[PDB]
Design a protein around this ligand. Structure first.
Ligand SMILES: OC[C@H]1O[C@@](CO)(O[C@H]2O[C@H](CO)[C@@H](O)[C@H](O)[C@H]2O)[C@@H](O)[C@@H]1O
Ligand SMILES: OC[C@H]1O[C@@](CO)(O[C@H]2O[C@H](CO)[C@@H](O)[C@H](O)[C@H]2O)[C@@H](O)[C@@H]1O
Ligand SMILES: OC[C@H]1O[C@@](CO)(O[C@H]2O[C@H](CO)[C@@H](O)[C@H](O)[C@H]2O)[C@@H](O)[C@@H]1O
Ligand code: CL
Ligand code: CL
Lengths: 298, 300
């Protein structure tokens, strides 16, 4: 069921399933997706949880206010959505920019977080080498092409042409990070939120928010702080990795998980950035088991 | 990844598959009739990242020894207990199907301090009448359920079961594929046959249906499993029950009421499946179990 909540004088669409008398799980998408990306995962988790999957402001079926769509704008709208829905605590399941939102939420409200399941996550990246980082000789080529594209996204004029005019994030980056080829009916709901250049403003804003080489400084610092909190947190964590992944290499995932407390690491196999589309059943089954286990003993 | 090893047990030996970090919690995987640790082969790789996985072949099954014993349920209890002691396992998760669940329930009733959690499916319970065997509320399942009762009544009949199971190898050749929705590949089916090259080698396979707790017979097993089920109902350790549609020993409707009656039991619905759920749902079961263990161990 796909519903709409009034949020800050605009609205956010969201998908909801499960008995609403169970622990809440918030599913947080990133760029350039929507709650659509969780569509095959939700039915596997709904038997054990009240699943809520919002569309970020300016994404999916959410409102399109005339705002900057910076990371901190998303923070405000997501906070307001959570308040409006009356959610007092939740598990968080996140990918891409959803992870930055999840990390920042957890840092500000540690009492809120029952657990964090995450994948293909954002972290401060001191150099461009740390974006699509990997130590695997065969992957060096793919990594450099990603770097080259996102450098252009973050270049004035060039990013506008690519994303606003040519729709490169939806038409190229999205399919580029899915191993399988989506059916027409699966791809179409990724296109429908973004019919015009103006509508694509949020999709351009996001790569310009990535914390790379100190910029943008405010996001970089916020995410450094959020990551410090995560490393100091004691709630359960579940990290998924694909092979070779994109933002998170399998070897990095192992090191990162070991750098936290109470972080399990689940290996999904062949995958790139949008792991949900290649591994929905594995993700859903894993998350559901994990919530069941936590709730049994917490 | 996965090594196959052998342990000396009570003068004989049990084979077992082992994979995972030796500093992780132990998970014991327990097969039933007429299978072996082979049935866990596609589940083990999904749990080994979070746990030290140990999957024994029951005495007289798979690559385990074939001592001259009756292969009654209590014989299996003794050999499994002895295996656990020999490997020096002091606590474990249990993952079980079929007679594996009877063994797990009986172990948990005697040594609840040993059980970190129980994940189970298509399990054995005391069945006061034949109608409780392959019980279905569903009109369109009734004939198939009746056929199953007729087959197992024959297995339990002196002379008849011998002809069917020892001579015709019906448990391996018919009952097993009968309880799998997909068709197994030749290479997947062959390791189910190799433990049982002769009629006499099939004695443990004939022994099991004759141990099923149905209408009070055999009395010792019926009593033991009544007691084990009482303990399960009162138990406080985490549980995970998987169900297929329609299943075989456990109907979806029965599963839902059963899980809801227990303490700390989650129910995981797998979709189309019969008795040998691992073969149709290895990935779903493995991912579920791994997530569940990871969650529990994160909270202590
Ligand atoms: O052990 C299973 C699984 O649990 C995790 C957290 O989900 O780690 C917990 O258990 C480990 C083994 O006992 C401990 O070493 C660890 O401190 C604890 O958090 C995963 O890391 C592990 O794979
Ligand atoms: O879930 C596996 C994941 O957990 C980590 C800690 O983040 O290690 C745990 O699990 C290992 C595998 O069983 C144990 O050997 C280890 O002692 C335990 O802390 C990661 O190393 C691993 O990727
Ligand atoms: O809650 C999800 C899942 O957890 C289980 C046990 O695995 O139940 C636990 O959580 C419930 C909600 O917090 C509690 O009411 C219950 O007592 C606790 O065991 C499953 O039953 C449930 O589906
Ligand atoms: Cl981005
Ligand atoms: Cl049997």
């Amino acid at each position: 069921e796909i519903r709409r909540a009034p949020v800050l004088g605009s609205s956010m669409a969201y998908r909801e399933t499960g008995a609403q008398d169970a622990p809440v799980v918030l599913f947080l998408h990133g760029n350039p997706t929507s709650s659509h990306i969780w569509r095959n995962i939700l039915p596997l988790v709904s038997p054990v949880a009240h699943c809520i999957a919002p569309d970020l402001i300016g994404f999916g079926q959410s409102g399109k206010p005339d705002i900057a769509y910076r990371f901190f704008d998303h923070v405000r709208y997501l906070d307001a959505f959570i308040e409006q829905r009356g959610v007092t605590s939740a598990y968080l399941v996140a990918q891409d920019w959803g992870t930055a939102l999840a990390f920042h939420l957890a840092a500000r409200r540690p009492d809120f977080v029952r657990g964090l399941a995450f994948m293909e996550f954002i972290r401060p990246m001191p150099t461009w080498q740390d974006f699509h980082h990997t130590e695997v000789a065969e992957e060096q080529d793919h990594a450099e092409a990603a770097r080259a594209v996102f450098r252009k996204f973050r270049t004035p004029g060039e990013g506008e042409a690519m994303i606003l005019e040519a729709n490169a994030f939806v038409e190229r980056v999205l399919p580029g990070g899915i191993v399988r080829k989506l059916g027409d009916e699966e791809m179409a709901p990724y296109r429908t939120p973004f019919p015009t250049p103006e509508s694509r403003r949020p999709v351009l804003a996001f790569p310009r928010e990535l914390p790379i080489a100190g910029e943008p400084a405010d996001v970089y610092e916020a995410l450094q702080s959020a990551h410090a909190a995560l490393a100091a947190s004691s709630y359960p964590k579940l990290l998924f990795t694909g092979e070779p992944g994109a933002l998170v290499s399998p070897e990095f995932a192992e090191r990162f998980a070991a750098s936290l407390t109470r972080c399990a690491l689940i290996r999904l196999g062949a995958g790139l950035h949008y792991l949900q589309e290649d591994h929905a059943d594995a993700i859903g089954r894993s998350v559901a088991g994990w919530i069941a286990g936590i709730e049994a003993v917490r």
